[PDB]
Design a binder for this molecule. Structure first.
Ligand SMILES: COc1ccc(Cc2nccc3cc(OC)c(OC)cc23)cc1OC
Ligand SMILES: COc1ccc(Cc2nccc3cc(OC)c(OC)cc23)cc1OC
Ligand SMILES: [Mg+2]
Ligand SMILES: [Mg+2]
Ligand SMILES: [Zn+2]
Ligand SMILES: [Zn+2]
Lengths: 325, 325
């Protein structure tokens, strides 16, 4: 009813490609991008049958997960969530990683992406520490939000008909949890430097087949790749078509400025990039690429050579655009 | 009223010596050893005046802290708490560490010792993980209890007239919290191997004055010593006079067997040393000394040479006693 009419279905076909219009999907789905993109990817990778997950349990979980993301939060919301999911899903399919990961590992990274920012208040760990918040007390000033994201994402499974893992062996369920925790905790931005250093080391001693597919025998190497993958997905805004990048930039500044406002009314030191009266959005983005995003993606490109070549070029293009204006 | 009459005051004079009868103090204080030993040490080190802490706030906090330890728990209770406090307090006074630590650092280690096991349910992290408990969900299967001890110990400050840190500069309060967190998290037994390795390295590159006092210029080295100190205090039962050691052994077995019971009724793999039908208390203690306690204390003795010589001899004596019976 008909084919050109349900535009949602039509847009959901670009799910396998880097540059999917996630905002369009957000709008057409009724501010429910995370649910529809998850279910598409789950069907696309057959995961419902592979792990005997009923569809009406999957739906019920995703609905509640999506609810527990905050709609009124500019950047760290359900859209960004769906963005990172979809981005992970694409990176899971680059040539150099074919058949490398098991269904369970794949499942872990997607689920990890799905929950990785849930219940985000729209302020940084440091703000939660400095304001002596409930959560920073709860988690002793270390990976405060990342810990809370995992707690929320996992607890929601206990909700009325929400256990998407119900029909898994304890061995699987325990392995999955181990992996999901390891990934989400790596999304903490204060770990970025170690992750990158670790990823650089892995590039030097990488093992590839005649085809050019990566050899990762041990869990230790595999989980590290997944950690970096979702971290890259988390920092992928500047690698998307400029049209999307600029909207992601608008949302991150609106959220940053909201924090800096609260920091101002409390008489605290205003956090970098949070002062709207000392703003330089464009120069900030150039810096963000030059010291965070580009060094990361260049190292990711080395690992999957040369699958991330288009991604890397787009980045250096967008870098030049923000340098120009 | 009189001097030989208040036996509590008389026993509280042995506070500065290794081998204080903590059980006697527990009984004479009305099952309130932690409060009375803390207040003695605080007065002994003048800390109330040095940090402008009012006495009736100190009392009110210690009362509530002591309450939040579980009396019905055989080993991980308020007595063990007071034991570890008192043991830390003694180790803080060995020749080789004179004037090494600041009042704030000293305060941190004692407070750390005081709270390090609060609200302990009497089961291990692993049990809390394997039973999918609230806390393991809350803290994502890593340092579960240690995290919870810190949370509880710190939250109780917010209670009606309990803020013992009220009259501290933000700079101090923030430094203290940083230190207290670092210490308590090191009490996690799964970290033992790293702590020991780290301590061994520190022994090799140790710097001492002509007097024979340790030189620790940076925070990095200082906090590491405090971490090991409280960890040693936590594993000091076998270094005490046999009279006390054997009671600590009775309490740890009663608690272990209570867990193994619960594990049995749930149909789980019974944890090492928790099966009362496959028990070998004496042989277990010999092993505990040979692979955990002695390797740790030998390394601690090297660091403070030769201050821990009596401690080390007593250990090897008690080792021989459990080997004999
Ligand atoms: C490790 O370095 C950082 C990493 C992340 C941030 C904050 C942040 N988090 C997630 C997505 C972001 C996305 C951004 O641009 C779209 C951005 O602009 C600088 C900051 C972002 C700040 C950082 O400090 C410069
Ligand atoms: C790192 O190794 C361990 C450390 C601690 C434990 C459990 C434990 N915790 C605190 C105090 C203890 C005190 C004990 O003896 C009094 C004891 O007996 C083996 C076990 C104890 C078990 C361990 O496994 C063998
Ligand atoms: Mg995050
Ligand atoms: Mg403990
Ligand atoms: Zn994110
Ligand atoms: Zn303890």
């Amino acid at each position: 009813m008909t084919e050109q009419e349900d535009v949602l279905a039509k847009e959901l076909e670009d799910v396998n490609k880097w540059g999917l219009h996630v905002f369009r999907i957000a709008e057409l789905s009724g501010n429910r991008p995370l649910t529809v993109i998850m279910h598409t990817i789950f069907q696309e990778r057959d995961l419902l049958k592979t792990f005997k997950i009923p569809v009406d349990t999957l739906i019920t979980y995703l609905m509640t997960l999506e609810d527990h993301y905050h709609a009124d939060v500019a950047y760290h919301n359900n859209i960004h969530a769906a963005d990172v999911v979809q981005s992970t899903h694409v990176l899971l399919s680059t040539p150099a990683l074919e058949a490398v990961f098991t269904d369970l590992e794949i499942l872990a990274a997607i689920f990890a992406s799905a929950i990785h920012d849930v219940d985000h208040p729209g302020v940084s760990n440091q703000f939660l520490i400095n304001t002596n918040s409930e959560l920073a007390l709860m988690y002793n000033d270390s990976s405060v939000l990342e810990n809370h994201h995992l707690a929320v994402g996992f607890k929601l499974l206990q909700e009325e008909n929400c256990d998407i893992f119900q029909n898994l062996t304890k061995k699987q369920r325990q392995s999955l949890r181990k992996m999901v925790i390891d990934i989400v905790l790596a999304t903490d931005m204060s770990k970025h430097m170690n992750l990158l250093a670790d990823l650089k080391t892995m590039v030097e001693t990488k093992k590839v087949t005649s085809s050019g597919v990566l050899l990762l025998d041990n869990y230790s190497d595999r989980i590290q790749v997944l950690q970096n993958m979702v971290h890259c997905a988390d920092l992928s805004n500047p690698t998307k078509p400029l049209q999307l990048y600029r909207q992601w930039t608008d949302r991150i500044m609106e959220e940053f400025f909201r924090q800096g406002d609260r920091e101002r009314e409390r008489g605290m030191e205003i956090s970098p990039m949070c002062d709207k009266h000392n703003a330089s959005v464009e120069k900030s983005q150039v810096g963000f690429i030059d010291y965070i995003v580009h060094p990361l993606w260049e190292t990711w490109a080395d690992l999957v050579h040369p699958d991330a070549q288009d991604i890397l070029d787009t980045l250096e293009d967008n870098r030049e655009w923000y340098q120009s204006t």
